[PDB]
Amino acid sequence: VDICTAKPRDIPMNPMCIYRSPEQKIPEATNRRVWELSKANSRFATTFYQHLADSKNDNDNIFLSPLSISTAFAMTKLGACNDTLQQLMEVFKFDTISEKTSDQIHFFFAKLNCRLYRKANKASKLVSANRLFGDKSLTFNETYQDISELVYGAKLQPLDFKENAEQSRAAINKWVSNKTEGRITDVIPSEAINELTVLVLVNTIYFKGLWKSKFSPENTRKELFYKADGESCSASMMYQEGKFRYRRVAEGTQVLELPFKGDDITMVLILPKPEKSLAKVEKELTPEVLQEWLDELEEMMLVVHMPRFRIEDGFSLKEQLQDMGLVDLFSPAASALPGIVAEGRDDLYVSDAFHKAFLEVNEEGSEAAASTAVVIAGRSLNPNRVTFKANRPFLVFIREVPLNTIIFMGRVANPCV
């Protein structure tokens, strides 16, 4: 059975413990709920990025899929109860959504991903590898396992953590590999899983878009990059002029949208003013202001200086999330996951969540329409040229056009090397 064309309540629905909390028009072909479960992620994405930002060095590149990190903990929200769930509800902002959704949610999140899966791969490539992991001994629910299969993709994979732990760890990794066909690997580090690691969250993504309008390699050359630590750098700097959508907000930060093939997936970049420190932008980042950056965009003839870069991120989500209010989900002494087991003695929790994202960005892209123009080629330039030479600290965003989902979030700090 395929979820991308199979409404809920067409499969065992309405699970155990369902949480309850004490004019904007819907786009073209779209389900009111998806667009909902979607905007929720958006709400969640900014907060999270922020925290995860302090966890690292202003000089380390950043990358990730809020939507993944989001959808995963949705497979937990699925089988959670009491004071534990509430949290998972208010930290992933799933408390805004309506009744139904806030229940079958785990399903929609799927129905969402699919949509975002096609358009993406249709012209470009998006690989994902994510599963939930638990020890043998524990006898996991039969149902959840059924749900988890036809919703998150696969069931839960029991491993011998207690037995030969590491033997199991490095067994997960390999799995990621045989799925992301190489690209992502070592999702989980060393000294992450020991003889207590009962349950771990694992979501990982790879993405390499395709420019709607390529970049000539022949116009790529080593130039300088002015790091935030003050330092200098030499990276591969690409370059091309064309009409793109763009906006210089009042503040002055610069918003550039570069579409991938088909204009279904664009990757806007946020390049602040040199006066401004990419951090302040990050310190002051809100969902409300993510809006301003896009809400008003104009198509202009702007020259784009963008670097060629790669970014592979691996990190424990637990550290962060915790600080954000999710506590119980990770404390054995006080959990509430009677949905995936309900038998032990309050013996089920999450030891860690491993998110591994990887982004590629070379000149590549294409449509190659044709030499569709054979007229007098005036030798003057566009009087209204505007330039975007992102040869310094800039944010990254990868979204869906109609739905406006923030697929990928990220930051380019150190390109060169």
Added chain:
Amino acid sequence: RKLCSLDNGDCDQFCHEEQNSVVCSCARGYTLADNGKACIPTGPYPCGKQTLER
């Protein structure tokens, strides 16, 4: 081939022929010399002159 045809009438700039005979003139900012076949500037930075101060 005759007047201005031959070595541009030994002038320094423009060549003509008022009264079946060679005549010279100069671009604005210049002043023909008393010898009549050479253009002597009128100021410091005159047209066509690559700025060279050293």
Added chain:
Amino acid sequence: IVGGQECKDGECPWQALLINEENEGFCGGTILSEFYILTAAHCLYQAKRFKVRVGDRNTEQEEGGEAVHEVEVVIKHNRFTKETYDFDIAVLRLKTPITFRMNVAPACLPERDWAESTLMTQKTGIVSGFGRTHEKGRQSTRLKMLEVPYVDRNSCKLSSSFIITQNMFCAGYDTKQEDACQGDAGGPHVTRFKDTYFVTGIVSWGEGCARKGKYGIYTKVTAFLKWIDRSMKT
């Protein structure tokens, strides 16, 4: 420009540069004198708010010596068309006169007849600007200049896909691949006689930039010295 080189201090003082409110060049000029600038017509067509910067040889780094003047009066040749690129020229009167200095001085304007017989017959001239450097490459940071053999009118025509007005003229190397390119329009094309340079044509159009058997098209100044100084009297 495509090929050529880089005007060393004071080799192309007349080069001017039109720039926008966001500050960006996009059309060469030709200092005709302390007030009037000589540029292309198509340059201002879809333009909007600009200014002329003089004697600046580097855009990535401003270091004085460079001056920014404002435009008091724009005058496009009333008979210009983006459909024939004929009459692609225009004169610019600034609001506050230029102050000549190194890297900054005019270029002389020939006298019709003499011109057509002494500069136009000459073998080469020098176009310059901050254009690209391949049909669709990068903009130049610095001010390149390049020499260009005049081309046989009757030949120009056989190579041209588009007609060639007697207002135009060709300049390119039969096989060498160097030329003027986008960002260069409106720039100077000066021809030397003795120790003086005269402006001869304006950087207009062309098919691509340095294509096989394709030539550089320049507005024949020598055929406007009239409409010019006429304009030079508003």
